[PDB]
Amino acid sequence: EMSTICDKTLNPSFCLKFLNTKFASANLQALAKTTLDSTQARATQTLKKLQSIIDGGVDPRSKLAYRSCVDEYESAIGNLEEAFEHLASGDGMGMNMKVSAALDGADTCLDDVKRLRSVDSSVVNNSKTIKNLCGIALVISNMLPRN
């Protein structure tokens, strides 16, 4: 669907590299966007939900862990958005850094809470789902051009 074009140029070799580069980049640019969004959405849901759980009241033990998770997710949501800005400036690296940070928040929450008696399913799943999502975004951020 691109060779059709390139073969008509006085320099197809150039064309292909360009059309394939810009196409790849555009593609990565889109997968990051969707991965980050899915991630941001789930982090936002888990964040409200934690804030709510804390509101509804829980034992001192669970309160503490759910409070640590809240701080991890507020910190993660900021980092995911920042990472989006780096994806935008084409700064895979800062993006990676930001995605890592976010991932660490999810992992730390996961750990602050996997030990609780009857943890909130939701918090747990979103936390693992988000670790997976950050995983993807981390990879994609590494494919971005650098000098």
JSON list of N, CA and C in Angstrom, two decimals, residues 8-48:
[
{"chain": "A", "resi": 8, "resn": "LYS", "atom": "N", "xyz": [7.07, 4.67, -7.98]},
{"chain": "A", "resi": 8, "resn": "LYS", "atom": "CA", "xyz": [6.86, 5.69, -9.00]},
{"chain": "A", "resi": 8, "resn": "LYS", "atom": "C", "xyz": [7.82, 6.88, -8.85]},
{"chain": "A", "resi": 9, "resn": "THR", "atom": "N", "xyz": [8.48, 6.97, -7.70]},
{"chain": "A", "resi": 9, "resn": "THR", "atom": "CA", "xyz": [9.41, 8.08, -7.44]},
{"chain": "A", "resi": 9, "resn": "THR", "atom": "C", "xyz": [10.76, 7.86, -8.13]},
{"chain": "A", "resi": 10, "resn": "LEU", "atom": "N", "xyz": [11.45, 8.97, -8.40]},
{"chain": "A", "resi": 10, "resn": "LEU", "atom": "CA", "xyz": [12.76, 8.90, -9.04]},
{"chain": "A", "resi": 10, "resn": "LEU", "atom": "C", "xyz": [13.78, 8.39, -8.05]},
{"chain": "A", "resi": 11, "resn": "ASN", "atom": "N", "xyz": [13.33, 8.15, -6.82]},
{"chain": "A", "resi": 11, "resn": "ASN", "atom": "CA", "xyz": [14.19, 7.62, -5.76]},
{"chain": "A", "resi": 11, "resn": "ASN", "atom": "C", "xyz": [13.30, 6.86, -4.77]},
{"chain": "A", "resi": 12, "resn": "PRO", "atom": "N", "xyz": [12.90, 5.63, -5.15]},
{"chain": "A", "resi": 12, "resn": "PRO", "atom": "CA", "xyz": [12.04, 4.73, -4.37]},
{"chain": "A", "resi": 12, "resn": "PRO", "atom": "C", "xyz": [12.69, 4.29, -3.06]},
{"chain": "A", "resi": 13, "resn": "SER", "atom": "N", "xyz": [13.99, 4.03, -3.12]},
{"chain": "A", "resi": 13, "resn": "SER", "atom": "CA", "xyz": [14.72, 3.60, -1.94]},
{"chain": "A", "resi": 13, "resn": "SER", "atom": "C", "xyz": [14.54, 4.65, -0.85]},
{"chain": "A", "resi": 14, "resn": "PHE", "atom": "N", "xyz": [14.78, 5.90, -1.21]},
{"chain": "A", "resi": 14, "resn": "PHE", "atom": "CA", "xyz": [14.61, 6.99, -0.25]},
{"chain": "A", "resi": 14, "resn": "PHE", "atom": "C", "xyz": [13.20, 6.95, 0.30]},
{"chain": "A", "resi": 15, "resn": "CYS", "atom": "N", "xyz": [12.25, 7.04, -0.63]},
{"chain": "A", "resi": 15, "resn": "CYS", "atom": "CA", "xyz": [10.82, 7.02, -0.36]},
{"chain": "A", "resi": 15, "resn": "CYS", "atom": "C", "xyz": [10.44, 5.99, 0.70]},
{"chain": "A", "resi": 16, "resn": "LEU", "atom": "N", "xyz": [10.69, 4.71, 0.40]},
{"chain": "A", "resi": 16, "resn": "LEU", "atom": "CA", "xyz": [10.39, 3.61, 1.32]},
{"chain": "A", "resi": 16, "resn": "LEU", "atom": "C", "xyz": [10.92, 3.89, 2.72]},
{"chain": "A", "resi": 17, "resn": "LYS", "atom": "N", "xyz": [12.22, 4.10, 2.85]},
{"chain": "A", "resi": 17, "resn": "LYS", "atom": "CA", "xyz": [12.80, 4.37, 4.16]},
{"chain": "A", "resi": 17, "resn": "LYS", "atom": "C", "xyz": [11.99, 5.44, 4.87]},
{"chain": "A", "resi": 18, "resn": "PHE", "atom": "N", "xyz": [11.68, 6.52, 4.15]},
{"chain": "A", "resi": 18, "resn": "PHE", "atom": "CA", "xyz": [10.92, 7.63, 4.72]},
{"chain": "A", "resi": 18, "resn": "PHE", "atom": "C", "xyz": [9.50, 7.23, 5.08]},
{"chain": "A", "resi": 19, "resn": "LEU", "atom": "N", "xyz": [8.79, 6.73, 4.08]},
{"chain": "A", "resi": 19, "resn": "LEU", "atom": "CA", "xyz": [7.41, 6.32, 4.28]},
{"chain": "A", "resi": 19, "resn": "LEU", "atom": "C", "xyz": [7.29, 5.22, 5.35]},
{"chain": "A", "resi": 20, "resn": "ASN", "atom": "N", "xyz": [8.32, 4.38, 5.48]},
{"chain": "A", "resi": 20, "resn": "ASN", "atom": "CA", "xyz": [8.30, 3.31, 6.46]},
{"chain": "A", "resi": 20, "resn": "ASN", "atom": "C", "xyz": [8.68, 3.84, 7.84]},
{"chain": "A", "resi": 21, "resn": "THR", "atom": "N", "xyz": [9.63, 4.77, 7.87]},
{"chain": "A", "resi": 21, "resn": "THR", "atom": "CA", "xyz": [10.06, 5.39, 9.12]},
{"chain": "A", "resi": 21, "resn": "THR", "atom": "C", "xyz": [8.91, 6.20, 9.72]},
{"chain": "A", "resi": 22, "resn": "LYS", "atom": "N", "xyz": [8.43, 7.18, 8.97]},
{"chain": "A", "resi": 22, "resn": "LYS", "atom": "CA", "xyz": [7.32, 8.00, 9.43]},
{"chain": "A", "resi": 22, "resn": "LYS", "atom": "C", "xyz": [6.11, 7.14, 9.81]},
{"chain": "A", "resi": 23, "resn": "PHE", "atom": "N", "xyz": [5.89, 6.06, 9.06]},
{"chain": "A", "resi": 23, "resn": "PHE", "atom": "CA", "xyz": [4.75, 5.16, 9.32]},
{"chain": "A", "resi": 23, "resn": "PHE", "atom": "C", "xyz": [4.96, 4.42, 10.63]},
{"chain": "A", "resi": 24, "resn": "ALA", "atom": "N", "xyz": [6.16, 3.88, 10.82]},
{"chain": "A", "resi": 24, "resn": "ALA", "atom": "CA", "xyz": [6.48, 3.18, 12.05]},
{"chain": "A", "resi": 24, "resn": "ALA", "atom": "C", "xyz": [6.30, 4.15, 13.20]},
{"chain": "A", "resi": 25, "resn": "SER", "atom": "N", "xyz": [7.04, 5.25, 13.15]},
{"chain": "A", "resi": 25, "resn": "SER", "atom": "CA", "xyz": [6.94, 6.25, 14.20]},
{"chain": "A", "resi": 25, "resn": "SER", "atom": "C", "xyz": [5.49, 6.58, 14.53]},
{"chain": "A", "resi": 26, "resn": "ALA", "atom": "N", "xyz": [4.71, 6.90, 13.52]},
{"chain": "A", "resi": 26, "resn": "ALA", "atom": "CA", "xyz": [3.31, 7.23, 13.73]},
{"chain": "A", "resi": 26, "resn": "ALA", "atom": "C", "xyz": [2.58, 6.10, 14.45]},
{"chain": "A", "resi": 27, "resn": "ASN", "atom": "N", "xyz": [2.94, 4.87, 14.10]},
{"chain": "A", "resi": 27, "resn": "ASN", "atom": "CA", "xyz": [2.33, 3.70, 14.70]},
{"chain": "A", "resi": 27, "resn": "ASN", "atom": "C", "xyz": [2.68, 3.62, 16.19]},
{"chain": "A", "resi": 28, "resn": "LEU", "atom": "N", "xyz": [3.97, 3.72, 16.49]},
{"chain": "A", "resi": 28, "resn": "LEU", "atom": "CA", "xyz": [4.40, 3.67, 17.87]},
{"chain": "A", "resi": 28, "resn": "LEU", "atom": "C", "xyz": [3.70, 4.78, 18.62]},
{"chain": "A", "resi": 29, "resn": "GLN", "atom": "N", "xyz": [3.75, 5.97, 18.04]},
{"chain": "A", "resi": 29, "resn": "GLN", "atom": "CA", "xyz": [3.12, 7.13, 18.63]},
{"chain": "A", "resi": 29, "resn": "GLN", "atom": "C", "xyz": [1.67, 6.83, 19.04]},
{"chain": "A", "resi": 30, "resn": "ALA", "atom": "N", "xyz": [0.98, 5.99, 18.29]},
{"chain": "A", "resi": 30, "resn": "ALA", "atom": "CA", "xyz": [-0.42, 5.68, 18.60]},
{"chain": "A", "resi": 30, "resn": "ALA", "atom": "C", "xyz": [-0.62, 4.60, 19.64]},
{"chain": "A", "resi": 31, "resn": "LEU", "atom": "N", "xyz": [0.27, 3.61, 19.67]},
{"chain": "A", "resi": 31, "resn": "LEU", "atom": "CA", "xyz": [0.16, 2.52, 20.63]},
{"chain": "A", "resi": 31, "resn": "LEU", "atom": "C", "xyz": [0.48, 3.04, 22.01]},
{"chain": "A", "resi": 32, "resn": "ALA", "atom": "N", "xyz": [1.41, 3.99, 22.08]},
{"chain": "A", "resi": 32, "resn": "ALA", "atom": "CA", "xyz": [1.80, 4.59, 23.34]},
{"chain": "A", "resi": 32, "resn": "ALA", "atom": "C", "xyz": [0.57, 5.32, 23.86]},
{"chain": "A", "resi": 33, "resn": "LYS", "atom": "N", "xyz": [0.03, 6.19, 23.03]},
{"chain": "A", "resi": 33, "resn": "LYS", "atom": "CA", "xyz": [-1.16, 6.95, 23.36]},
{"chain": "A", "resi": 33, "resn": "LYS", "atom": "C", "xyz": [-2.24, 6.07, 24.00]},
{"chain": "A", "resi": 34, "resn": "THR", "atom": "N", "xyz": [-2.65, 5.00, 23.32]},
{"chain": "A", "resi": 34, "resn": "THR", "atom": "CA", "xyz": [-3.68, 4.09, 23.84]},
{"chain": "A", "resi": 34, "resn": "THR", "atom": "C", "xyz": [-3.29, 3.33, 25.12]},
{"chain": "A", "resi": 35, "resn": "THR", "atom": "N", "xyz": [-2.03, 2.89, 25.19]},
{"chain": "A", "resi": 35, "resn": "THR", "atom": "CA", "xyz": [-1.54, 2.15, 26.34]},
{"chain": "A", "resi": 35, "resn": "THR", "atom": "C", "xyz": [-1.56, 3.07, 27.53]},
{"chain": "A", "resi": 36, "resn": "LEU", "atom": "N", "xyz": [-1.01, 4.27, 27.36]},
{"chain": "A", "resi": 36, "resn": "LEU", "atom": "CA", "xyz": [-0.97, 5.25, 28.44]},
{"chain": "A", "resi": 36, "resn": "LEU", "atom": "C", "xyz": [-2.38, 5.61, 28.88]},
{"chain": "A", "resi": 37, "resn": "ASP", "atom": "N", "xyz": [-3.28, 5.79, 27.92]},
{"chain": "A", "resi": 37, "resn": "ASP", "atom": "CA", "xyz": [-4.64, 6.14, 28.27]},
{"chain": "A", "resi": 37, "resn": "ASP", "atom": "C", "xyz": [-5.32, 5.05, 29.10]},
{"chain": "A", "resi": 38, "resn": "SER", "atom": "N", "xyz": [-5.28, 3.81, 28.61]},
{"chain": "A", "resi": 38, "resn": "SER", "atom": "CA", "xyz": [-5.86, 2.67, 29.34]},
{"chain": "A", "resi": 38, "resn": "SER", "atom": "C", "xyz": [-5.32, 2.72, 30.76]},
{"chain": "A", "resi": 39, "resn": "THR", "atom": "N", "xyz": [-4.00, 2.88, 30.85]},
{"chain": "A", "resi": 39, "resn": "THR", "atom": "CA", "xyz": [-3.30, 2.95, 32.11]},
{"chain": "A", "resi": 39, "resn": "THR", "atom": "C", "xyz": [-3.79, 4.10, 32.98]},
{"chain": "A", "resi": 40, "resn": "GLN", "atom": "N", "xyz": [-3.85, 5.29, 32.41]},
{"chain": "A", "resi": 40, "resn": "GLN", "atom": "CA", "xyz": [-4.31, 6.47, 33.16]},
{"chain": "A", "resi": 40, "resn": "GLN", "atom": "C", "xyz": [-5.75, 6.26, 33.68]},
{"chain": "A", "resi": 41, "resn": "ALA", "atom": "N", "xyz": [-6.62, 5.75, 32.81]},
{"chain": "A", "resi": 41, "resn": "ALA", "atom": "CA", "xyz": [-8.00, 5.48, 33.18]},
{"chain": "A", "resi": 41, "resn": "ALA", "atom": "C", "xyz": [-8.10, 4.53, 34.36]},
{"chain": "A", "resi": 42, "resn": "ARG", "atom": "N", "xyz": [-7.37, 3.41, 34.31]},
{"chain": "A", "resi": 42, "resn": "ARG", "atom": "CA", "xyz": [-7.41, 2.45, 35.40]},
{"chain": "A", "resi": 42, "resn": "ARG", "atom": "C", "xyz": [-6.82, 3.00, 36.69]},
{"chain": "A", "resi": 43, "resn": "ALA", "atom": "N", "xyz": [-5.76, 3.80, 36.57]},
{"chain": "A", "resi": 43, "resn": "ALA", "atom": "CA", "xyz": [-5.12, 4.40, 37.74]},
{"chain": "A", "resi": 43, "resn": "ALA", "atom": "C", "xyz": [-6.10, 5.37, 38.39]},
{"chain": "A", "resi": 44, "resn": "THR", "atom": "N", "xyz": [-6.81, 6.12, 37.55]},
{"chain": "A", "resi": 44, "resn": "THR", "atom": "CA", "xyz": [-7.79, 7.08, 38.05]},
{"chain": "A", "resi": 44, "resn": "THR", "atom": "C", "xyz": [-8.91, 6.33, 38.78]},
{"chain": "A", "resi": 45, "resn": "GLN", "atom": "N", "xyz": [-9.39, 5.22, 38.21]},
{"chain": "A", "resi": 45, "resn": "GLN", "atom": "CA", "xyz": [-10.46, 4.46, 38.86]},
{"chain": "A", "resi": 45, "resn": "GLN", "atom": "C", "xyz": [-9.96, 3.89, 40.17]},
{"chain": "A", "resi": 46, "resn": "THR", "atom": "N", "xyz": [-8.79, 3.27, 40.14]},
{"chain": "A", "resi": 46, "resn": "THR", "atom": "CA", "xyz": [-8.24, 2.70, 41.36]},
{"chain": "A", "resi": 46, "resn": "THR", "atom": "C", "xyz": [-8.02, 3.80, 42.39]},
{"chain": "A", "resi": 47, "resn": "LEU", "atom": "N", "xyz": [-7.60, 4.99, 41.95]},
{"chain": "A", "resi": 47, "resn": "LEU", "atom": "CA", "xyz": [-7.38, 6.07, 42.91]},
{"chain": "A", "resi": 47, "resn": "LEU", "atom": "C", "xyz": [-8.65, 6.50, 43.60]},
{"chain": "A", "resi": 48, "resn": "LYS", "atom": "N", "xyz": [-9.69, 6.81, 42.83]},
{"chain": "A", "resi": 48, "resn": "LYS", "atom": "CA", "xyz": [-10.91, 7.23, 43.47]},
{"chain": "A", "resi": 48, "resn": "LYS", "atom": "C", "xyz": [-11.35, 6.14, 44.45]}
]
